[PDB]
Amino acid sequence: KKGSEQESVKEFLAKAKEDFLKKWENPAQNTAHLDQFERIKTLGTGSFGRVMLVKHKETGNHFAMKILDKQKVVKLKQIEHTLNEKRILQAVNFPFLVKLEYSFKDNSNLYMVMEYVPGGEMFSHLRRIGRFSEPHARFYAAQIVLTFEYLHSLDLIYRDLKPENLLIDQQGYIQVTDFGFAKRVKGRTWTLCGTPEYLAPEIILSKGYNKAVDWWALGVLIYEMAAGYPPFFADQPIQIYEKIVSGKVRFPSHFSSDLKDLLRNLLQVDLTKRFGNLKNGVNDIKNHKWFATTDWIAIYQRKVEAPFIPKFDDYEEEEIRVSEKCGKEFSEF
Amino acid sequence: KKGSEQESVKEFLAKAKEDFLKKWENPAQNTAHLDQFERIKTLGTGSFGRVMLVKHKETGNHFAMKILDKQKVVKLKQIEHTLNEKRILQAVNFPFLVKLEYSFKDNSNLYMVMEYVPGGEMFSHLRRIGRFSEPHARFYAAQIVLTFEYLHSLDLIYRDLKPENLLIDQQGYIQVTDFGFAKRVKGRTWTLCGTPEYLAPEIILSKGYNKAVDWWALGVLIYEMAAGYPPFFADQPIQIYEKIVSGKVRFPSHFSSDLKDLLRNLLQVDLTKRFGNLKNGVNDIKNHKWFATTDWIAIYQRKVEAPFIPKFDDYEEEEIRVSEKCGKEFSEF
């Protein structure tokens, strides 16, 4: 039971930390190679490069290949960010983090091959469906909770949670993507980053911050998942900041009482008082009334039936140009 | 027939111009007064002020009341824009322009009372439904065509057409709203304005422009109505401009042939060559193949059945503060 759960997580998190430190320090370099994947179709694009749907010639598995054009990355000054994501990503291992299956580079480009998640991002389902019900939202919250719990024990702080980076999988579960802001930080950090509407009052107030930033982000999420829109927004970030800074939310009436209370303990301006920050940390979140019905090990195990499960002219193809090129810069990749 | 139509419009446009010049020059000042309307509920808000759903105590009619707070307008430097819209609006009169039923001011505020259009804006139906069919889109285009034809003969150039300012009425027809960019200009103008994605290559290239800007805007519209998204877009206006400037559109395959051709004559970078600008003007648009099936007088008469017809916690009320105040500035209102 309970104690017995605690028992378990403890043990787990500990073994987990051992594997992470190992990788963290003794990495992973040139896993596969281009030629070993067949090119199926452009899934999307963007600065940095285009993201392709590929299938691994032997294995017949499908992956999503992110192709970063070295030169572009360098120009947009995203070297450090690119190398740190590769690093974090090949070190970590958790049911709800998308997986970095293979990595490689060539004259021209950097390649990151993750596990293909067809359902897409929550963001779009969210705006289309409108609102998620307290229970649908709770399923997703449960998953994030755990992830944060894990992530944090590795001194990592995800710094950009928002529906846009949570993709829905074949079984209805979440997968956290894109770690280009994560930081391993045993302490306080100061850089200013993330998305406006999710930013913690501390980040903008320029005081240095820590793990607690992601627990205030959690609060915006459940709020936007259950409301339909975020607790603070305005067209013009400045404006937004202002509001986040007063820390004055208006919960919709259909909220629960129980959900308001949790929200109010997450949407805390005072770190001292924020749930997630107190001596007990997670525990304060997992023991909340709002989560009473939640089987956490059950969720860690994908054992719970999920409530939702996702199921135009196409692109204008092109050609991995591959033609050393920025070689000093990306040596660590 | 045809000739006979031509006959008519001629006559019409002429009489129309006579009424417009009259008002243009001999206006309309303090029509109603606050007390004569009961306050039903906030429909929306914003800088400048909030927009209310009111009902005219005697008459029992519903209006939408725009309340502009003099001080705010002055601070955001929108005096000239506010007075010119009031002016244009009380001068004009056309089946598809929302109506300025009453106007007034008081110590505190400026009041513009238009006809209430419950269906909302096309923008939202558009993004929800997704795409409009060549025929649904054609119905809307037909209406805009006419409006532009009218508007222009009064030397007015609307300078901001986009799905967001076209509201759908009770019978499925369009109503053009918000004229805070319109200009009466017998000639070329130079100010830089409108929405990025609808901007004419000339506006951004800073060469002075004229009526033709609204015919290039028409082209973006039918394009976004039929495609789902605009012919030029990018996250970051700069980017957008660039593309508009090359004037290189990609029509989706489901387009018609006939619709491509019209589009290509509207999405013309060369004014010399743009449909709407040539000797014949409108005529080049109304005689296009894409519109062959269109009964224009029929449409002017709302005689055609429309294809679509439109049919959360509420606001946090407040209080017309009314408490002279900016009196020099808004004298002309």
């Binding site: 963001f123 705006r127 950009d160 928002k162 846009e164 802001f181 200013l192 980053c193 993330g194 998305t195 406006p196 509407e197 339909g228 829109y229 975020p230 607790p231 603070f232 927004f233 305005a234 067209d235 970030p237 939310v249 208006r250 | 429909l43 929306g44 808000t45 914003g46 939202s124 996250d235 959360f312 916690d313 509420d314 606001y315 946090e316």
Partner: peptide, 18 residues
């Protein structure tokens, strides 16, 4: 704050980072 005001802002699409 409210649905009507949020679906009127420009912020209903994917938001970027800073």
């Amino acid at each position: 704050t409210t649905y009507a005001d949020f679906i009127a802002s420009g912020r209903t699409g994917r938001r970027n980072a800073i």
